[PDB]
Amino acid sequence: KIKGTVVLMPKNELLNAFLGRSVSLQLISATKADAHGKGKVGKDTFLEGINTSLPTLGAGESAFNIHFEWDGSMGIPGAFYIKNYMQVEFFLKSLTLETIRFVCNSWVYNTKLYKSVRIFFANHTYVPSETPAPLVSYREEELKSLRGNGTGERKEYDRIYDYDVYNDLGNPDKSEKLARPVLGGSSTFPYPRRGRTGRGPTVTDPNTEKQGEVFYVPRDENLGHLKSKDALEIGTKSLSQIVQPAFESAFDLKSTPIEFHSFQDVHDLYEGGIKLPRDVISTIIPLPVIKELYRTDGQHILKFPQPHVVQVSQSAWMTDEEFAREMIAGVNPCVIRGLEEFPPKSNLDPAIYGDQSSKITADSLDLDGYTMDEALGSRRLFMLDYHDIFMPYVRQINQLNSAKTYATRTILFLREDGTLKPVAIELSLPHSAGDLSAAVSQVVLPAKEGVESTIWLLAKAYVIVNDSCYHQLMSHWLNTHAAMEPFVIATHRHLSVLHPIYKLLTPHYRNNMNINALARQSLINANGIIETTFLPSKYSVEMSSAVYKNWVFTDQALPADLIKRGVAIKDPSTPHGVRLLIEDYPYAADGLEIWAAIKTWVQEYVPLYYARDDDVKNDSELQHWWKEAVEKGHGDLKDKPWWPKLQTLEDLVEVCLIIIWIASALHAAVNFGNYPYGGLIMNRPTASRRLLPEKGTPEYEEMINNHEKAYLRTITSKLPTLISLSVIEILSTHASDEVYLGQRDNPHWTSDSKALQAFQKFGNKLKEIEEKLVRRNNDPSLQGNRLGPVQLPYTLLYPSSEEGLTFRGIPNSISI
Ligand SMILES: [Fe+3]
């Protein structure tokens, strides 16, 4: 008989009841097959007893002994079936035979709920052509089980992965004001697909999916946590459904001032705190995750944590130096572009928006003594250009009550000292014969004194409102969360758990479908958190669809992105093949190090399973996986010529490298600085509510006499500020059970020592890189861009981190 050990976690975690005839397992042979070519299956074997021997276990886990009637004639077991006869589900961790290891990490529901018996494979890795013959059909049948048939309402215990469009955000049955365009499946609104839920149509609209208390994700995608405080993804739901209403009542009852009246009222939030009604505090204080967001006296006070950006200087955010520095080392460091001609041009139709010629004059700019031609030629001119991106939406946004924006463009000059300085801001508005508004476009230049300094500060706020919107919806939501989901779905639908590429990529998908489903429900839904806290309101998500029209997979590679944006040039004589035009560009310089480490890892892994390009072309699973990811997952862009073909080792490496980059380092860089930089609403306003005032009006006089109030009346109001600070605080927090780049949730994910050795080298390289990044932050010559006047060391690309709001650490995946 074969001695075995089963490790599982009872539901209450995320014992004698498991004995008796509660759980049975059946070994399956990988070498001996029946008359049909399928591995022979053993007898039902039940758990015999609780093993309390090994000191190693922890995590609310329990081990059970079991002995299998299996002689050499049945061959070597390569898989097993398991049936749970208990009413309640349990989390199966692993099976070990004494060595043959099985890494399961899967919920096993009552046997009657399953159409086919749950099957698990040993930790060996096989491309299809290498699958032991007795396991071939089992392998394909499990993939067919995972794909489902594209119909039906998905249930909690289902493990069916499929695609659908974003037609579940509107709530037309509640109000036609909550109706939203379907995103995806049309040329008007192209969009990445998301996980199919199948709840069916709304009563009023056959094209929109009805509401649901729970937005399904394949069962094992819904991460349980040993500590409730680690279930960060449930925070947005509680925030939108419970906390927001409580905050709103405090305002409706006039228990707290409706608006901030000075910058100190904002600073007060993380100092003495804000006093709220007792019942409001009582509503918030007992909630999991939410209670970790604020310190309280348990009675009337809520205190937010001090954001990193003000920890050394609370006023530094208002410096021109910090405004420009955050474009290369801030929460959204990947939009700035080189400017090689002047004035900047627009590709928008003047027949629609009016003359689009820039009004910025070269002679008005202070380029530290450089002429415009000199600045252009020396590659010292850059820009943060939101003119063409926002112009198409300015009219409709400005028609909203309490929303007014400009399509902005900021010109930056790279000083000889290596820091960026802002030299002009153009605030553009569309013009069309017949416009009722008399407001016009204008250029604002830097100023430190007088009303001119206030107008320049407001111009920076309009720019950052554009940036915050683009950051949240595009850099963050579209480019990481939404763009990655199709790849997660395709991977489970077409790459067997035995597949080397499945093993290479899946750690980088942890919690992504889960947070996305929770986002469709409470973050990007009609009247959800984003719509109620950011400038575009009901136009927010569709704006991301317009941007997706220009999304290019291969341009997500870091070198390609830097080159496309004109912030680096190709240069083979450099370590990374590219020369940065802003040498001390923190995000890019640190990013290239991480990018290189991932590349080395993928390049070492792939060859272990694919010897030649032909081996990649002939992998049926791999080919079906890619064809589906492109043609269905990102199907609205299937007509684009830039998609890799995946017929060579090079292409496979490229595709995997880009996927891992987006899921780990790119997402970390644009996510974990959310509260550290945006926790002070003045530094990262999410909305603007009025345009610049006309001379001779009280609003203009206010800019002169009360600049802080002029600023506060312009940016996000206090109520939505409380809600948005809470959400970005959640998003910037690392759960204590996070799995970071260079780590895996199990040391036995594969039995291949070669793959394991390569992974160990990858982790060692990341530790090596962290020491280098530490040296960069400690280098006094780099203080200007790596720390700035806010004296905040750029640690967002440090690979490792402890739990919490740390401003560092690269998780493997888009996990929050
Ligand atoms: Fe995120």
PDB file of N, CA, C and O in Angstrom, residues 757-785:
ATOM      1  N   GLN A 757      15.662  25.698 -10.280  1.00  0.00           N
ATOM      2  CA  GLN A 757      16.940  26.383 -10.117  1.00  0.00           C
ATOM      3  C   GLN A 757      16.900  27.749 -10.792  1.00  0.00           C
ATOM      4  O   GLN A 757      17.430  28.732 -10.265  1.00  0.00           O
ATOM      5  N   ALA A 758      16.271  27.796 -11.956  1.00  0.00           N
ATOM      6  CA  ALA A 758      16.169  29.033 -12.714  1.00  0.00           C
ATOM      7  C   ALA A 758      15.342  30.048 -11.933  1.00  0.00           C
ATOM      8  O   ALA A 758      15.632  31.247 -11.945  1.00  0.00           O
ATOM      9  N   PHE A 759      14.310  29.572 -11.248  1.00  0.00           N
ATOM     10  CA  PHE A 759      13.464  30.486 -10.491  1.00  0.00           C
ATOM     11  C   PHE A 759      14.224  31.048  -9.286  1.00  0.00           C
ATOM     12  O   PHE A 759      14.057  32.212  -8.901  1.00  0.00           O
ATOM     13  N   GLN A 760      15.070  30.216  -8.688  1.00  0.00           N
ATOM     14  CA  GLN A 760      15.865  30.640  -7.543  1.00  0.00           C
ATOM     15  C   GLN A 760      16.849  31.740  -7.991  1.00  0.00           C
ATOM     16  O   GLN A 760      17.104  32.701  -7.262  1.00  0.00           O
ATOM     17  N   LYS A 761      17.407  31.589  -9.183  1.00  0.00           N
ATOM     18  CA  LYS A 761      18.332  32.589  -9.700  1.00  0.00           C
ATOM     19  C   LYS A 761      17.612  33.910  -9.923  1.00  0.00           C
ATOM     20  O   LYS A 761      18.187  34.965  -9.704  1.00  0.00           O
ATOM     21  N   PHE A 762      16.361  33.829 -10.370  1.00  0.00           N
ATOM     22  CA  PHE A 762      15.535  35.014 -10.630  1.00  0.00           C
ATOM     23  C   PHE A 762      15.309  35.768  -9.317  1.00  0.00           C
ATOM     24  O   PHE A 762      15.473  36.994  -9.249  1.00  0.00           O
ATOM     25  N   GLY A 763      14.972  35.039  -8.257  1.00  0.00           N
ATOM     26  CA  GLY A 763      14.770  35.693  -6.979  1.00  0.00           C
ATOM     27  C   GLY A 763      16.040  36.316  -6.427  1.00  0.00           C
ATOM     28  O   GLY A 763      16.016  37.366  -5.778  1.00  0.00           O
ATOM     29  N   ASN A 764      17.168  35.652  -6.657  1.00  0.00           N
ATOM     30  CA  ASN A 764      18.436  36.175  -6.176  1.00  0.00           C
ATOM     31  C   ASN A 764      18.768  37.455  -6.929  1.00  0.00           C
ATOM     32  O   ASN A 764      19.256  38.417  -6.346  1.00  0.00           O
ATOM     33  N   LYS A 765      18.483  37.456  -8.222  1.00  0.00           N
ATOM     34  CA  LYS A 765      18.735  38.626  -9.049  1.00  0.00           C
ATOM     35  C   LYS A 765      17.871  39.784  -8.538  1.00  0.00           C
ATOM     36  O   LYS A 765      18.334  40.916  -8.473  1.00  0.00           O
ATOM     37  N   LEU A 766      16.624  39.506  -8.161  1.00  0.00           N
ATOM     38  CA  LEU A 766      15.772  40.599  -7.671  1.00  0.00           C
ATOM     39  C   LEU A 766      16.304  41.197  -6.368  1.00  0.00           C
ATOM     40  O   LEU A 766      16.210  42.403  -6.136  1.00  0.00           O
ATOM     41  N   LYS A 767      16.874  40.368  -5.506  1.00  0.00           N
ATOM     42  CA  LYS A 767      17.432  40.876  -4.262  1.00  0.00           C
ATOM     43  C   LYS A 767      18.638  41.761  -4.582  1.00  0.00           C
ATOM     44  O   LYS A 767      18.865  42.778  -3.934  1.00  0.00           O
ATOM     45  N   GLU A 768      19.391  41.357  -5.601  1.00  0.00           N
ATOM     46  CA  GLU A 768      20.565  42.081  -6.072  1.00  0.00           C
ATOM     47  C   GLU A 768      20.116  43.450  -6.581  1.00  0.00           C
ATOM     48  O   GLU A 768      20.738  44.476  -6.299  1.00  0.00           O
ATOM     49  N   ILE A 769      19.012  43.453  -7.319  1.00  0.00           N
ATOM     50  CA  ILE A 769      18.482  44.693  -7.871  1.00  0.00           C
ATOM     51  C   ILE A 769      18.019  45.631  -6.762  1.00  0.00           C
ATOM     52  O   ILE A 769      18.271  46.834  -6.812  1.00  0.00           O
ATOM     53  N   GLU A 770      17.354  45.090  -5.746  1.00  0.00           N
ATOM     54  CA  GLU A 770      16.904  45.939  -4.662  1.00  0.00           C
ATOM     55  C   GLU A 770      18.087  46.667  -4.009  1.00  0.00           C
ATOM     56  O   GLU A 770      17.996  47.851  -3.721  1.00  0.00           O
ATOM     57  N   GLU A 771      19.213  45.979  -3.800  1.00  0.00           N
ATOM     58  CA  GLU A 771      20.368  46.641  -3.199  1.00  0.00           C
ATOM     59  C   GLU A 771      20.829  47.802  -4.075  1.00  0.00           C
ATOM     60  O   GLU A 771      21.228  48.854  -3.569  1.00  0.00           O
ATOM     61  N   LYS A 772      20.760  47.611  -5.388  1.00  0.00           N
ATOM     62  CA  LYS A 772      21.162  48.642  -6.338  1.00  0.00           C
ATOM     63  C   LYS A 772      20.216  49.842  -6.264  1.00  0.00           C
ATOM     64  O   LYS A 772      20.657  51.002  -6.292  1.00  0.00           O
ATOM     65  N   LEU A 773      18.917  49.568  -6.159  1.00  0.00           N
ATOM     66  CA  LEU A 773      17.948  50.663  -6.090  1.00  0.00           C
ATOM     67  C   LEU A 773      18.130  51.451  -4.791  1.00  0.00           C
ATOM     68  O   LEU A 773      17.941  52.673  -4.757  1.00  0.00           O
ATOM     69  N   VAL A 774      18.525  50.756  -3.729  1.00  0.00           N
ATOM     70  CA  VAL A 774      18.768  51.394  -2.442  1.00  0.00           C
ATOM     71  C   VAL A 774      19.945  52.344  -2.607  1.00  0.00           C
ATOM     72  O   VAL A 774      19.913  53.482  -2.105  1.00  0.00           O
ATOM     73  N   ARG A 775      20.973  51.886  -3.323  1.00  0.00           N
ATOM     74  CA  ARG A 775      22.138  52.725  -3.556  1.00  0.00           C
ATOM     75  C   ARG A 775      21.712  53.957  -4.369  1.00  0.00           C
ATOM     76  O   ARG A 775      22.189  55.061  -4.116  1.00  0.00           O
ATOM     77  N   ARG A 776      20.803  53.777  -5.328  1.00  0.00           N
ATOM     78  CA  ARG A 776      20.340  54.926  -6.104  1.00  0.00           C
ATOM     79  C   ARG A 776      19.650  55.945  -5.206  1.00  0.00           C
ATOM     80  O   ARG A 776      19.922  57.146  -5.297  1.00  0.00           O
ATOM     81  N   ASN A 777      18.759  55.488  -4.328  1.00  0.00           N
ATOM     82  CA  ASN A 777      18.069  56.432  -3.467  1.00  0.00           C
ATOM     83  C   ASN A 777      19.005  57.110  -2.482  1.00  0.00           C
ATOM     84  O   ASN A 777      18.754  58.211  -2.032  1.00  0.00           O
ATOM     85  N   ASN A 778      20.105  56.450  -2.154  1.00  0.00           N
ATOM     86  CA  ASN A 778      21.052  57.052  -1.226  1.00  0.00           C
ATOM     87  C   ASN A 778      22.098  57.929  -1.916  1.00  0.00           C
ATOM     88  O   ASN A 778      22.871  58.611  -1.241  1.00  0.00           O
ATOM     89  N   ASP A 779      22.105  57.939  -3.247  1.00  0.00           N
ATOM     90  CA  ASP A 779      23.057  58.738  -4.011  1.00  0.00           C
ATOM     91  C   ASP A 779      22.627  60.205  -4.022  1.00  0.00           C
ATOM     92  O   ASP A 779      21.636  60.564  -4.645  1.00  0.00           O
ATOM     93  N   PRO A 780      23.366  61.082  -3.324  1.00  0.00           N
ATOM     94  CA  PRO A 780      23.036  62.503  -3.257  1.00  0.00           C
ATOM     95  C   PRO A 780      22.870  63.198  -4.603  1.00  0.00           C
ATOM     96  O   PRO A 780      22.119  64.163  -4.706  1.00  0.00           O
ATOM     97  N   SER A 781      23.565  62.721  -5.628  1.00  0.00           N
ATOM     98  CA  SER A 781      23.466  63.358  -6.936  1.00  0.00           C
ATOM     99  C   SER A 781      22.103  63.142  -7.579  1.00  0.00           C
ATOM    100  O   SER A 781      21.719  63.898  -8.471  1.00  0.00           O
ATOM    101  N   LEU A 782      21.376  62.125  -7.117  1.00  0.00           N
ATOM    102  CA  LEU A 782      20.068  61.792  -7.698  1.00  0.00           C
ATOM    103  C   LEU A 782      18.903  62.257  -6.848  1.00  0.00           C
ATOM    104  O   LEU A 782      17.750  61.920  -7.138  1.00  0.00           O
ATOM    105  N   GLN A 783      19.182  63.023  -5.807  1.00  0.00           N
ATOM    106  CA  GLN A 783      18.143  63.475  -4.898  1.00  0.00           C
ATOM    107  C   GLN A 783      17.029  64.251  -5.592  1.00  0.00           C
ATOM    108  O   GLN A 783      15.866  64.098  -5.245  1.00  0.00           O
ATOM    109  N   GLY A 784      17.401  65.084  -6.562  1.00  0.00           N
ATOM    110  CA  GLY A 784      16.422  65.926  -7.231  1.00  0.00           C
ATOM    111  C   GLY A 784      15.226  65.193  -7.812  1.00  0.00           C
ATOM    112  O   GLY A 784      14.093  65.662  -7.674  1.00  0.00           O
ATOM    113  N   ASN A 785      15.482  64.075  -8.486  1.00  0.00           N
ATOM    114  CA  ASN A 785      14.367  63.337  -9.080  1.00  0.00           C
ATOM    115  C   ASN A 785      13.920  62.128  -8.296  1.00  0.00           C
ATOM    116  O   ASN A 785      12.739  61.726  -8.368  1.00  0.00           O
TER     117      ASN A 785
END
